């Protein structure tokens, strides 16, 4: 997204989707950003730090965003079992 001599042009680098990698865009209001806080031993939330997930508008419209979110959070490592890869 650059010119010839370094200098990065192309204003605003879009957000990729977490689920399908489709570009969520400026006008699109159906898209969502989920923020999950970082737990540890000694309990409690610990504000400041977030594991983020950008769900697209289409994914939410179609109505299988839930499944995608179950998948995404699992590989990060905050769900023992829950969602089977197999079916």
């Amino acid at each position: 997204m650059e010119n010839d001599k370094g200098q990065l042009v192309e204003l605003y680098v879009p957000r990729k989707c977490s689920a399908t990698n489709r570009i969520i865009k400026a006008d699109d209001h159906a898209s969502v950003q989920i923020n999950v806080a970082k737990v540890d031993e000694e309990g409690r939330a610990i504000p400041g730090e977030y594991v983020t997930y950008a769900l697209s508008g289409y994914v939410r419209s179609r109505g299988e965003s839930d499944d995608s979110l179950n998948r995404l959070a699992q590989n990060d490592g905050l769900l023992k079992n829950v969602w089977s890869y197999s079916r």
Binding site: A30, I34, R60, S61, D66
Partner: protein, 206 residues
């Protein structure tokens, strides 16, 4: 990531199973959601409670991440659910809405009931469809308390629970509220059963 503290205890399981949350829908499991366990006779499909607890912990963990507790908004049209949301607002932060949702809420100002929530929670997506659809036009994630028969449009971290009433939805709400008090609060680990009872939420007689 996944500590040994935040696990499904037997007492909580015995509460859940007492409440009949594990009894799923009569008619059909919607194909969008796989949270099924043994198609038992007499037309009932049992839900994985280990998942239910976990999804609840996810939702709670999401809620705890939001900086101001006032901006979250619980929604309900079922009287039981209305009571529950009022209790959720009584204990934790998060201003509720009971009864008629009063459309045009999350959309543009001018109305009195103008709220711009970071996050929204719903009892039933079929009965509060207008709320779900309202949320989509201003970057509001939804966390519904779905059943097997219910939809899952515009929903995130949908929790599979029985949403008929009596003692069911209130139990789920109790679990959520308790969880989010345990996070960002002064409560101890699994040892403490907490002062407030599950009997407080449930239903509203007569």
């Amino acid at each position: 990531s996944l500590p040994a503290t935040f696990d499904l205890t037997p007492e909580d399981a015995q509460l859940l199973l007492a409440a009949n949350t594990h009894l799923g829908a009569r008619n059909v499991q919607v194909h969008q959601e796989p949270y099924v366990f043994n198609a038992r006779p007499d037309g009932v499909h049992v839900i994985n409670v280990g998942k239910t607890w976990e999804k609840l912990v996810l939702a709670a963990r999401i809620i705890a991440a939001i900086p101001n507790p006032e901006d979250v908004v619980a929604i309900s049209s079922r009287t039981f659910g209305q009571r529950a949301v009022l209790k959720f607002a009584a204990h934790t932060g998060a201003t509720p809405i009971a009864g008629r949702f009063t459309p045009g809420s999350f959309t543009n100002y001018i109305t009195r009931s103008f709220k711009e929530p970071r996050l929204v929670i719903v009892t039933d997506p079929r009965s509060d469809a207008q709320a779900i659809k309202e949320a989509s036009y201003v970057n509001i994630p939804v966390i519904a308390l779905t059943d097997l028969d219910s939809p899952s449009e515009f929903v995130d971290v949908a929790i599979p629970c029985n949403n008929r009433g009596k003692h069911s939805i209130g139990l789920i709400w109790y679990l959520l509220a308790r969880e989010v008090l345990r996070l960002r609060g002064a409560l101890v680990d699994r040892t403490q059963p907490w002062s407030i009872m599950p009997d407080l939420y449930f239903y509203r007689d007569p």
